[PDB]
Each structure stands twice: as structure tokens, then as C-alpha cells.
């Protein structure tokens, strides 16, 4: 009988423990593996894949394809804001239900640059230039184009190349940010403006749509595994 001495923790049951345990099926012959397309090794592999962002949460539209449409049309001026949402990949309703956001919501911390790809779905004859911008926190969200261009931005010119990317560089005072909301962990404001208004010819629709895709960059990571707020129940399903 080898003199032993149990220590605190003994007999407990940690949900995240990691020990060996006897098989209930001694010598069971597992079914041989098989090459199945598209294996997944890390969730970040998924978070690097673009998914369509619902920038237009506005009212009832959340219950239609319109949620994914960004209104753009010919105006009698330029400088007009086209949209504007915060950099809260986890919290903001704009991202929260995205492929990226869904994943973030199973974690507590996030870090890395993010890509916002914008595809112009107007007509071949429609043209124009937009100013995609990212303003780090500290001041308020820019309210005029002339104040947004003072920050990190990309002047996108619509043409044969349908889409254009606004890479939101990870600028932050800490290594990681909270997936949940917190002002310490404030991420800044993402806004779009008209650089040079939409200009179509006759017989070509002057009102268009712009889609927005979001995905993580190669320097993106997530920490502290937690449960999603997005799924609930009252009783075991039957």
C-alpha cells in the first residue's frame, strides 16, 4: 500500500477537466476513417471566410433580404453619409450574427484586423466613388465626410473590379478587446461617405445597392471560451 495523500480538488468534477477514463466498450473496433472534403481544424479557419453583413437593421427589414442591402443613389450633392456602425464584432447587432460574430460570441476576448469587402451591385453603367473610413475611438463618430477622411480610410472607385476592401487595422491600447461591450475596450467607428456621387446614364436605374462582407485577417485570434447568449430554451425539446 503506497503511502498517498489526497489534495484539494480531489473527487470534484470540473467541466473543463482533462483526464483518462476507462472505456465502456473494451476493444471496440472503430469504423475506419474516410477522406471527407473540407475538414476543419480551428474555428478561425471559418472566421476568415467572408459572410454578408446586415448593415440595414432598420426596423422591419431584418425580416427580408433588404437587411443585407446598402442604399446608394444619385444625389444633388456629395459628402452624404451612406452608413455607419461601430467596431464591435461581437456586440453590435450589425456583426453579432455574422459568421465572424457567431464565433466571437463563444469567446470573451478578440484581437486582430478585420476585412470589410464591399461589392457594388449597381448596373454596369452606374459609376461613382465612395470613401470607406475607420476612425479609432477617442473623439466621436465623424459626422461629416471632411472629418472622417482625417482617419484611416480607403477611397473606393467603382469599376470593372466590383468589390473593394477596407482593412480595419487592429489599433487598440490592449492586446485583446472584449467580445462583450465595454468602453475601456472601445473599438472606434466605421463609416462610409459619397466621394463623388453615383452617376448613371438614361435608361439605367439611379438607385442601387452595395453589399458588405466581413471576415478576419491572418492576425486574428480569440480567447476565454464561454457560452453564447444567442441560444436558449425552457425545457428539453421533445
Amino acid at each position: 500500500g503506497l503511502p498517498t495523500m489526497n489534495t484539494p480538488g480531489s473527487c470534484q468534477f470540473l467541466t473543463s477537466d482533462d483526464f483518462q477514463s476507462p472505456s465502456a466498450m473494451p476493444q471496440y473496433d472503430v469504423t475506419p476513417e474516410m477522406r471527407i472534403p473540407g475538414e476543419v481544424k480551428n474555428l478561425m479557419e471559418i472566421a476568415e471566410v467572408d459572410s454578408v453583413v446586415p448593415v440595414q437593421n432598420v426596423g422591419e427589414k431584418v425580416n427580408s433580404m433588404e437587411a443585407y442591402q446598402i442604399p446608394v443613389r444619385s444625389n444633388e450633392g456629395s459628402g452624404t453619409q451612406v452608413f455607419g456602425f461601430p467596431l464591435q464584432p461581437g456586440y453590435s447587432s450589425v456583426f453579432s450574427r455574422t459568421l465572424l460574430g457567431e464565433i466571437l460570441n463563444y469567446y470573451t476576448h478578440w484581437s486582430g484586423s478585420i476585412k470589410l469587402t464591399f461589392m457594388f451591385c449597381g448596373s454596369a453603367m452606374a459609376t461613382g466613388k465612395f470613401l470607406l473610413a475607420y476612425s479609432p475611438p477617442g473623439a466621436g463618430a465623424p459626422t461629416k465626410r471632411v472629418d472622417a477622411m482625417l482617419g484611416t480610410h480607403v477611397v473606393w472607385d467603382v469599376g470593372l473590379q466590383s468589390s473593394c476592401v477596407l482593412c480595419i487595422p487592429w489599433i487598440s491600447q490592449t492586446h485583446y478587446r472584449y467580445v462583450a461591450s465595454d468602453e475601456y475596450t472601445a473599438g472606434g467607428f466605421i463609416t462610409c461617405w459619397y466621394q463623388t456621387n453615383i452617376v448613371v446614364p438614361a435608361d439605367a436605374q439611379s438607385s442601387c445597392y452595395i453589399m458588405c462582407f466581413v471576415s478576419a485577417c491572418n492576425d486574428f485570434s480569440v480567447r476565454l471560451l464561454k457560452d453564447t447568449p444567442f441560444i436558449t430554451q425552457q425545457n428539453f425539446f421533445q
Binding site: 483518462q20 476507462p22 472505456s23 473494451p26 471496440y28 481544424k41 480551428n42 479557419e45 467572408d50 471576415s215
Partner: protein, 55 residues
């Protein structure tokens, strides 16, 4: 015959499997492989970042 791996940090640990079935072993928490290509970029013709996607 035990094994000796590296712990997670910013040292090693010893492991000896005690059961006759691999099913009984602890989790494989250290497989850091990654291959985004299968998902992001499953195009047949390689797309060079700096180039135009269409011409």
C-alpha cells in the same frame, strides 16, 4: 514508457496512458494545424492578391 510534451505558455509535462483503448486517452488539445484555403480561396485558378480579379 511515458511521453513528455510541452505545456501551454507565453516547461514540459509527463503522460502515461493507463488503458488498453485509445478512446480512454485524454483530449488532443494541442493540434494547432491550420488550412484556411479549403474555405477562403477554393478557386481553381490562383488569384494573386496584388492583381485584378478580372481583366
Amino acid at each position: 514508457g511515458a511521453q513528455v510534451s510541452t505545456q501551454k505558455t507565453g516547461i514540459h509535462y509527463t503522460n502515461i496512458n493507463y488503458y488498453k483503448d485509445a478512446a480512454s486517452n485524454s483530449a488532443n488539445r494541442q493540434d494547432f494545424t491550420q488550412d484556411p484555403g479549403k474555405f477562403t480561396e477554393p478557386v481553381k485558378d490562383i488569384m494573386i492578391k496584388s492583381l485584378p480579379a478580372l481583366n
